[PDB]
């Protein structure tokens, strides 16, 4: 690997979890973990600018966006670098997930935050005033700082 | 400035606080904090390798030491990059401190941990087998993940 990181998440309600990052190759970052306490269904998952938790998830800034792109889904060419699309919580409120990203690098996101949202990310497709800005996924439920790890 | 960071400390006991970093110039990093819940007296303060809290303060690794130096005080040229010496808690258990460090950089610290110790850092001077390794300051009381904060 070329770097490992871990985000330990929590928030003002029931939502908590642990998500790990591993830069498998220079091209591919593995992001995998488990978040629970969720309502069943799709929840937006994004990396945000900052990891400042002094105002809980409010001091984390916006989706990480170094290239000045619009909001999109993880497969889209026009996406914020922090845009990881949705994860699904099952009927027990548990989201166990695994994705690889080609844009996000561990070395870029160290000390930033990983945040899960109240609702579904529309992936910029929703035709809503927020679609190309946030994905219209409602409140931030839980956040964790992306911290360096031995792995 | 050339970057900002923040760490929120907690541990198993009463120790907690907030510490902020700002890289003022290429030479100088401002570190300013308040930590409460301490026993009165001197406590070691260090940046450690990792910000991984999955085993609480035990997964943070050792003092950050990219240059393979010996442990020292913050004004020494033989020190770990992460060596910030002692902070003093007053009679009420509060340590308010402000340092300007010439070696530690804000880009060093982010994603790592800031840890405050049970006892006094001997600054490498104590003649003990741990002096040049840790400063012999006992247990870890509290640790905070050092996060990026807004630079403007
Ligand atoms: Zn976005
Ligand atoms: Zn040291």
Residue numbers in the entry:
A (entry chain A): 85 to 235
B (entry chain B): 85 to 236
The paper states:
SOD1 folding, zinc and copper acquisition, and disulphide bond formation can be catalysed by the copper chaperone for SOD1 (CCS), which forms a transient heterodimeric complex with SOD1 to facilitate its maturation. Here, we discover the mechanisms that govern SOD1 maturation and stabilisation through interaction with the chaperone protein hCCS. Combinations of mutants yielded crystallographic structures of full-length hCCS in two different conformers complexed with hSOD1; an hCCS domain II truncation complexed with hSOD1; an hCCS domain II homodimer structure at higher resolution than previously available (1.55 Å); and the hSOD1 disulphide knock-out mutant used to promote complexation.
When homodimeric hSOD1 and hCCS domain II are physiologically zinc metalated, many of the terms that comprise binding free energy are equal due to their sequence and structural similarity. Indeed, orientation of monomers and the presence of four inter-subunit hydrogen bonds found in homodimeric hSOD1 are maintained by hCCS. However, the hCCS dimer interface is replete with positive charge and therefore not dominated by the hydrophobic effect seen in hSOD1 and many other protein complexes. Most importantly, however, the presence of hCCS Ala231 significantly weakens half of the homodimer interface hydrogen bonds conserved from SOD1. Specifically, Ala231 side-chain methyl pushes Arg232 and Gly135 apart through steric repulsion, lengthening the carbonyl-amine hydrogen bond between them to 3.08 Å from 2.75 Å, in the case of the homologous SOD1 residues Ile151 and Gly51. Without this rearrangement, hCCS Ala231 Cβ would be an energetically unfavourable 2.3 Å from the Gly135 carbonyl oxygen. Thus, relatively weak CCS homodimer affinity has been evolutionarily maintained to provide a pool of monomeric CCS available to interact with and activate nascent monomeric SOD1 within a physiologically relevant timescale. The SOD1-like, hCCS domain II found within each complex structure has an intact intra-subunit disulphide bond in contrast to the yeast orthologue. This disulphide does not dictate complexation but does thermally stabilise the hCCS homodimer and the complex with hSOD1.
